């Protein structure tokens, strides 16, 4: 933690200085002599260690989660802060882990989101649903919580931010997943000649849903049922209601064969595979929503090799010369995708915003952070978009990395660690 | 240690072992990673020697002659210089080997898998500016060849006292002039504003265009820079017309075929060259992107987006990313058909990929920095973006250095 950096801006010339980054907690995965800014999970630093922690180790970090949370809250010492402190202690004591207040459950849940580099929509942090589901006891009712999340995030299409947060980890055994990546997403199926149908990114998981009794429509955009798990419980299927499912059927403003191609998207991204780490304590099953940037549909799930991988279709259309990379027929046919993306969820009246918009409204919620909090941990190789990137202003903003608790975590896909009963 | 990176499109998994033999820091720490800042923060005797015996140790093994009669008395003879003199000069084969080296290390470069095939001018017995001119017409020549592009580089004299040095004061052999207008606006390109004031209050007499080439100012042996006026016919350019839209050819661009940087410094075995200009071709972006598309550059989304037609009033109908797409048409199709030697961001991310996999395999790695190899349109369409990397600091190197005009001290009264 250097005493105090500074980030340029190379297209405005603002300069910005970073103090924040020396309340940073753990590893980054560089080092002085190697950066690692391009590894996808760079390090395995943890807060604490693999199960049941003893008290010595579990301790520490919920005194100073509690501690960040009264200091943030115009206390630190008081009354109510010295007394949660010994609560803490007690329980901890007497079950070896401890539970939040639904304040400081609130407060951890947006702190995650406001700390999480990756995120370019973090302008949005402070406005965010918290549904408390820690009185969850099965995968029915896990799946109850979940149907009300979608229905309340979607709200007809003018969705909501919104996060529904299930019992922490106790032993490890008894954990809360959803098993899904995210909440909504479309099968996969391995086609006999070899070719894949629908997404190939969900084919693993498609097989574990057949494999379990779920009966394949066998279509490019079949909605993947839940699977859930609860208290460690072998996990179990539910389709999603397809009313509470919003989709935009994807055409273009000028070309009317575009409809003909039948792609369409669901309105609402929810990541539900990520975990939730507050004062020591690990929210496995966390699944949080926003809304799309129209890039992660229209370049990123249309246009990755290992995707939907729609741009040679859509150039054969355009009559684009596919015949050498230098004709620029991808990059053609991938602008108007993301028009037609874009168009689809406007004229449906389901929240959207374009790469140009997102990353504007960043470097403003950068400069608020830097003006209050002194610094915002932010991921470049992340954050700018995965077209167009040096005509966003994203491009030529500096930034600094650092991993600052509460967080958002990866955590292994729960098939790789799961003893069926 | 070894350490993985892996490619998410194909799930390649490589090891690199490589970077265990890097020394400088690259600015990140245990607790922050400063891998998108553009720049993160003379030698002793005692210095030299260290750096010297590892180049020499590293040039003897690359030749498989380590160990050997010949490295041991090299070694010997290099240190009997700096004892003597305080410094070291580099047999010809060594500046070459380190040259090319330096180019192999750049990790900012997805032009790499040419590294090997570097044509290496020695210019250490240069003395004056009118000199370094002539060097560098012979080197513009060459590396022009008709438009059939060269890669080469010419080296200077190395750093002695640092009150010596050898400059070139352009930041790349040809830049076009930019001048800014009493009523705010800028005639040309706007990053070369303050050199074109330094030409001008050096003697220069500026056409004051749009696309004039500027002169060379050229410093030897710490001496004040003079002016030198390229040789027209050495600057080959290319009008940009577009395969489809009539009008292009209206906006009146063109640019010059040879990226020729040349305010960088190379480091070889701890000696410092710091006028050491190199050339290559270009990728279409750096132009059709960055030089025409910038906001601080020449900012021309608007004007080439109305003769398109777009409806420019909202964000969202992707009228700028529409208007940048032909703009990278236009550069290549105009290169191409002046047989001008360039190549597009698709075909040069695939070569690197082969490239840094064959490194990995042959010598256990290829430092690379993402934010820089990752091109600025298209980028996950590109196989790099999909590509984990390993950033680390490897000598022979391209450093930067400070701009001239801000360390020399004027001699002139
Ligand atoms: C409200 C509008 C939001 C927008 C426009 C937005 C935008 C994005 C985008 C574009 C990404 C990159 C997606 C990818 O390439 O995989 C991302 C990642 C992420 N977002 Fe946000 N986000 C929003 C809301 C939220 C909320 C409510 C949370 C949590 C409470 C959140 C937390 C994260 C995290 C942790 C990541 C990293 C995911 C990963 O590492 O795979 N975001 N966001
Ligand atoms: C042969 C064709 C080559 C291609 C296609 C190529 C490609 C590129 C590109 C696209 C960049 C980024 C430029 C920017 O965004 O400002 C770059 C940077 C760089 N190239 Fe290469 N290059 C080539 C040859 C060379 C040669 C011959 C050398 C050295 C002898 C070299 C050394 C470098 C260095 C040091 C940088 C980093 C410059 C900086 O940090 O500003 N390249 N190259
Ligand atoms: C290897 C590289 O880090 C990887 O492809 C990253 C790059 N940047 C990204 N940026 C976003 N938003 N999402 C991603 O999945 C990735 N992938
Ligand atoms: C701030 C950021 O590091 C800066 O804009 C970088 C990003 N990547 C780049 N990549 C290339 N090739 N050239 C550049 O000048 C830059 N600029
Ligand atoms: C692989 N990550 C997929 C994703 C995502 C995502 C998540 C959220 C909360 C918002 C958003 N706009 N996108
Ligand atoms: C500010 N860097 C400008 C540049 C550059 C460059 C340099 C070389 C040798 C090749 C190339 N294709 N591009
Ligand atoms: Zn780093």
Known sequence: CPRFLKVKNWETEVVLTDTLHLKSTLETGCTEYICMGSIMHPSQHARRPEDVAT??????????????????????????????????????????????????????????????????????????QVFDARDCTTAHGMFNYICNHVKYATNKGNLRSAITIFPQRTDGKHDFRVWNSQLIRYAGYKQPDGSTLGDPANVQF????????????????????????????????????????????????????????????????????????????????????????????????????????????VAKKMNLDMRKTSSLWKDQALVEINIAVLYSFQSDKVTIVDHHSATESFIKHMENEYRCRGG??????????????????????????????????????????????
């Not at 700018?384 to 608790?405: A, C, D, K, W």
Request: glycine share 6%; with cysteine.
């Open 206 to 313: 498609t097989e574990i849903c057949i494999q379990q009794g779920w009966k394949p429509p066998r279509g490019r955009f079949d909605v993947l049922p839940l699977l859930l798990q609860a208290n460690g419980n072998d996990p179990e299927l539910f389709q999603i209601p397809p009313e509470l499912v919003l989709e935009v059927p994807i055409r273009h403003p000028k070309f009317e064969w575009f409809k003909d191609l039948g792609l369409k998207w669901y309105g609402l991204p929810a990541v539900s595979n990520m975990l939730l780490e507050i004062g020591g304590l690990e929210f496995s099953a966390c699944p949080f929503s926003g809304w799309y940037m129209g890039t992660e549909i229209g370049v990123r799930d249309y246009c990755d090799n290992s995707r939907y991988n729609i741009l040679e279709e």
């Open 55 to 128: 008290k010595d180790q579990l301790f520490p970090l919920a005194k100073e989660f509690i501690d960040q949370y009264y200091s943030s809250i115009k206390r630190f010492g008081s009354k109510a802060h010295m007394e949660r402190l010994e609560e803490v202690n007690k329980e901890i004591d007497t079950t070896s882990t401890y539970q939040l207040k639904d304040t400081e459950l609130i407060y951890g849940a947006k702190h995650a989101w406001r700390n999480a580099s990756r995120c370019v929509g973090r302008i949005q942090w402070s406005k965010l």
């Open 376 to 421: 915002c941990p932010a991921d470049w190789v992340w954050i700018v978009p995965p077209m167009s990137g040096s005509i966003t202003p994203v491009f030529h903003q500096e930034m600094l990395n650092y991993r600052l608790t509460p967080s958002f975590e990866y955590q292994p896909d729960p098939w790789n660690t799961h003893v069926w009963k």
